Structure 1
Amino acid sequence: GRTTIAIDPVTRIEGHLKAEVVVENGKVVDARLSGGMYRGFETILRGRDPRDASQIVQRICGVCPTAHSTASVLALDEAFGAKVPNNGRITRNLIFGANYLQSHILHFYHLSAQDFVQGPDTAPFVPRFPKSDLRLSKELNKAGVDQYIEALEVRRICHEMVALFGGRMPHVQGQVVGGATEIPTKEKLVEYAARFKKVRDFVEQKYVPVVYTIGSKYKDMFKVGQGFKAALCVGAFPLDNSGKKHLFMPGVYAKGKDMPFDPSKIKEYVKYSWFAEETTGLNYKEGKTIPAPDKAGAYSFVKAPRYDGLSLEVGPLARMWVNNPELSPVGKKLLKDLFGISAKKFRDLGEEAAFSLMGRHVARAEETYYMLGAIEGWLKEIKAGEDTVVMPAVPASAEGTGFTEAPRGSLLHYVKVKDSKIDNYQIVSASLWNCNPRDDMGQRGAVEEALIGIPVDDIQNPVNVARLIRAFDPXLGCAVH
């Protein structure tokens, strides 16, 4: 009865992923995710001037490098005892916030949209599965195509926004220990705001409405992909200089309950990962990275992070669920008009629909709208001309941890400094939380679990396997590093 389907490479994600599922009676009944490429940034970093980390770590991933930059400089700030000036904190938020817009827009249109929208008869939009379950009307499919094309311009403008104070993108030069390297001028602030206005218009008028509208043709996709229904947020985008208030506040949600985040409860397991057996179960402060590509039973270069034993997911759904902000005006209206749902705040979607294949796309669109308001605020808060950096000395001995939220989910970097050089550097990244293999006790990773129950009514056209995976916006470069 059972059929095993292997998909390598899973495409329209970042990086190298193999998915293997077992299908029985038209549904996925088991799953394994394999991250098949390793670079080993945690060992490459050793012995370097710690200030180099904020450049080296960005090369983990050219889609989300500002996230790694941010985590790294936050770790360095702590280890160096550097107090980032108020204006530099805001400048960092403007650099990084612009890439949230870029990344979510890239994800929905250029990675995910072909899951629902039929492209024209030209590579790379053909060939594809003969029965791809593409349900949109002539008009709606055309809207998807036109918006994919427009989004190419919009995501590029987002990178212009990042580069204004960031230097260039991918791989910014503009964030360093102690703040930001370039004070915003009045002139460049006008340039940033002009671009921001165009991005806002696209997000409000095209992107958010299209996700709900496509979602309304795929209501069945809100009923699958729940997985553990457990979420993590470690906080991001500091709104003051005392490390208190953040745009996204930290918290954990599991078994229907909200609880504080305590990073000491993070452990990384490796039984099913290609790393030396003796390195299993380490918290990141004690982390070790010893590759073992021939180890029997292992199936991924992604370690298996667990929070107090729990397998959690991260990303826009996780943050929006944990923080529970008010929904966008257009979202509220489409929920009413298309879904018959009266909703005010994000959790009004209900746990079941929020933690679903389509729910995660909706969360990402809502979060993009939410970020618009934050950037609007920072553009009013920033003061042209005010210094954005301090120049701290390299300490001989120190440690630091930087916590932030990458567009795909929770990210932390830990650095230990000895003899003025990097002694250890450990990275616990977003897609690591989502796309990891089983832990030592046999508990599946978040996406592995969310695959359970996914419908596969046609083994010759098993499109929902990768649709589920793409809803999580996986980045296997980040997950493995």
Structure 2
Amino acid sequence: TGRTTIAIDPVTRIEGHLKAEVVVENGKVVDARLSGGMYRGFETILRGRDPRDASQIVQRICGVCPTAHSTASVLALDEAFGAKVPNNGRITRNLIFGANYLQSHILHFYHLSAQDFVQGPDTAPFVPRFPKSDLRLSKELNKAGVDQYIEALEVRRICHEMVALFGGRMPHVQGQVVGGATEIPTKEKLVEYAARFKKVRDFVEQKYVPVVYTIGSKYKDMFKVGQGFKAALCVGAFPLDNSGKKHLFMPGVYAKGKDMPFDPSKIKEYVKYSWFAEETTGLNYKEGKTIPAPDKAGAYSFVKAPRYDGLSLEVGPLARMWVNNPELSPVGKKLLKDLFGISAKKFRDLGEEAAFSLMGRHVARAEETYYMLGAIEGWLKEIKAGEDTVVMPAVPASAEGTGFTEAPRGSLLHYVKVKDSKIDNYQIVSASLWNCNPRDDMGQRGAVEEALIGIPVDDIQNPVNVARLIRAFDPXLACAVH
């Protein structure tokens, strides 16, 4: 068969404003463009402010992952100010932020992604939908998915209670500032956090991780599509001591079948196909500039195009779990054997092709959730009730700092330059920026654009696999554009 061109705007069951346009020929995607259609301009709004305001302002980039921006911002401020965060504040920050990993991954699989494979109740917002939605689960297993969707609503709410115990509230924590965390954990509130954590752990181990492998086993064809560049980025996250060298996720780049170190000087943001002034293309974040140009011919997105030494990389759970190669959960090992016939001990035992796939990214996210449980368990043993968590540094007149972390959806950095005790420049290079960006100046596609190539579309009237692929990356266009 010939060509059909399909535009999807809005792509739903993601966060934010995204149009996807694919060219389908002979039943497969052969080209793709992603367009982020909403811009706010945090990088210019921030200029001239007290630098400490940043760790509140930047959270409003995104209400799903605000703790990630809070973290990147206070780390950047920590560096710029010379703030020496007390050890107990490092742990408290990890407890605040780690709890939202659990919230975000559970939200993404059940409340954003699961309807790709499960038919919800016969009322809005679960209907109407594609008449041929390719929903393969038995009546029993479908009902189980709906029941878990409903239970997961309570579980993700409990995760935000965990965030708020030491973060003040959620969305948009008050509890992280330059210098550490604003509230010393008490024994009483640590028991409250732990009791909620136990309920989340049970759900993750008994329902979430098993259901992802189980649904995946009914959709084994979805491990054979969505490979894209098979190239990934991790910048490191969640320090496990004050050395600055040991982290729950260690940094690394993976491309063309090779592991390589991460050098942040290799990051450049291109804008040829983005609605920004042509003269701003090719800037490292330390010299970044944000000059919107919504009428620029040929551009098709408010997302800049980040490249790592010219490479187009993806970010997120798959990227982190591939780069770090942790041992698989007990659940995963067993169901990989029983349901897939796969003998695996570590994450990379999935194989590059299966890991870098539509369903592989859902599996990585589930495995990572399980991985995070162990980290939070350790922090709950490490934290000292009553030990101070903050220092109160003076605002410098002149300074710069960069904060690197991993948001639930992938690598995040904030760069701040202070002059006359105010923000002179603030540049954000976020997770869904790396995934959902347009072509760079030489025409090389962004990671999701490339992963769409080869996606099957047997029925152009029900092109469900296009957005299925996109949702596997858990996109957040508010983060991508800011």
Q: TM-score, normalised by structure 2?
A: 1.00
SS in 2 for 1:232: strand
Deviation at 1:80, TM superposition (A): 0.3
Q: CA deviation at 1:242?
A: 1.6
Aligned partner of residue 303 in structure 2, secondary structure: coil
What SS is found at the alignment partner of 1:281?
Answer: coil
Shift of 1:139: 1.0
- Show CA shifts across 1:159-198 (max 9, x none): 0000000000000000000000000000000000000000
SS in 2 for 1:128: coil
Could you list the runs of 5+ residues in structure 1 that have no partner in the other structure? Answer: none
Shift of 1:423: 0.0
In the TM superposition, what whole-angstrom CA distance separates every residue of 1:55-104 from its partner, at most 9, and x where no partner exists? 00000000000000000000000000000000000000000000000000
Aligned equivalents of 1:275, 1:233: Cα separation in 2: 27
CA distance in 2, matches of 1:378, 1:221: 36
Map of 2:37 onto structure 1: 36
Aligned to 1:436: 437
> 1:216 and 1:85 mapped to 2: Cα distance?
46
Distance 1:463 1:234 in 2: 33
Q: How many residues align?
A: 481
Question: Percent identity among equivalent residues?
Answer: 100
CA separation in 2, counterparts of 1:130 and 1:81? 58
Take 1:12 and 1:111, find their aligned partners in 2: how far apart are those partners?
5
1:429-477 deviation line (CA, Å, top 9, x unaligned): 0000000000000000000000000000000000000000000000000
Aligned residue number for residue 117 of structure 1: 118
CA-to-partner distance for each residue in 1:16-49, whole Å, 9 max, x for gaps? 0000000000000000000000000000000000
Q: 1:142, 1:201 → 2: CA distance?
A: 20
Matched, 1:96 2:97: yes
List aligned pairs for 1:373-452, cutoff 5 A: 373-452=374-453
Distance of 1:421 and 1:101 partners within structure 2? 35
Distance in 2 (alpha carbons) for counterparts of 1:286 and 1:242? 28
CA distance in 1, matches of 2:358, 2:240: 32
Partners of 2:22 and 2:129 lie apart in 1 by 20
Secondary structure, aligned partner of 1:416: strand
Deviation at 1:235, TM superposition (A): 0.1
Distance, in Å, in 2 between the alignment partners of 1:96 and 1:44 is 25
d(CA) in 2 for partners of 1:223, 1:337: 19
CA distance in 1, matches of 2:304, 2:204: 35
CA displacement 1:275-318 (0-9 Å, x = unmatched): 00000000000000000000000000000000000000000000
Counterpart Cα distance in 2 of 1:140 and 1:93:
36
Which residue in the other structure is 1:313 paired with? Answer: 314
Which residue pairs with 2:475 in the alignment? 474
- In structure 1, C-alpha distance between the alignment counterparts of 2:225 and 2:385, rounded to whole Å: 49
Structure 1 segments, 4+ long, off by >6 Å, are: none
Cα distance between partner residues in 1 of 2:122 and 2:376: 39
What CA deviation, in whole Å up to 9, does each residue of 1:193-232 have, x standing for no partner? 0000000000000000000000000000000000000000
Note the C-alpha offset of 1:120: 1.4
Deviations 1:109-131 (A, max 9, x none): 00000000001110000000000
| Structure 2 residue 137 is the aligned partner of structure 1 residue 139 | no
Counterparts of 1:416 and 1:224 in 2: how far apart (Å)? 42
Distance (Å, rounded) in 2 between the aligned partners of 1:194 and 1:361: 27
Structure 1 vs Structure 2 CA RMSD = 0.3
3-state DSSP class of the match of 2:218? coil
- Give the secondary-structure state (helix, strand or coil) at the position aligned to 1:261: coil
C-alpha distance in 1, partners of 2:307/2:152? 36
Q: Give distance in 2, aligned partners of 1:297 and 1:257.
A: 34
| 1:291 matched residue in structure 2 | 292
CA–CA distance in structure 2, aligned partners of residues 150 and 2 of structure 1:
43
DSSP-derived class of the 1:295 partner = coil
Deviation at 1:420, TM superposition (A): 0.1
Could you report, residue by residue, the CA deviation over 1:145-170 in whole angstroms, capped at 9, with x for unpaired residues?
Answer: 00000000000000000000000000
Cα shift at 1:424: 0.1
SS in 2 for 1:334: helix
Cα distance in 1 for residues equivalent to 2:241 and 2:99: 19
Rounded Cα–Cα distance in structure 2 between residues aligned with 1:331 and 1:138: 24
Distance in 2, matches of 1:256 and 1:28, equals 24
Give secondary structure in 2 for the equivalent of 1:216: helix
Residue deviations 1:356-387 (CA, integer Å, cap 9, x gap): 00000000000000000000000000000000
- Is 1:357 the counterpart of 2:375? The answer is no
Structure 1 residue 389: Cα displacement: 0.1
Measured against aligned partners, the alpha-carbon deviations of 1:217-275 in whole angstroms (never above 9, x if no partner) come to 00000000000000000000001112110000000000111010000000000000000
User: Take 1:120 and 1:250, find their aligned partners in 2: how far apart are those partners?
Assistant: 42
In the TM superposition, residue 327 of structure 1 has moved relative to its aligned partner by: 0.1
Structure 1 CA distance for aligned equivalents of residues 10 and 65 of structure 2? 21
Question: Distance in 2 between the 1:5 and 1:282 partners?
Answer: 33
Superposition deviation, residue 403 in structure 1: 0.0
User: What's the secondary structure of 1:56's corresponding residue?
Assistant: helix
Task: Tell me how far apart the structure 1 counterparts of residues 367 and 480 of structure 2 sit (CA, whole Å).
Answer: 24
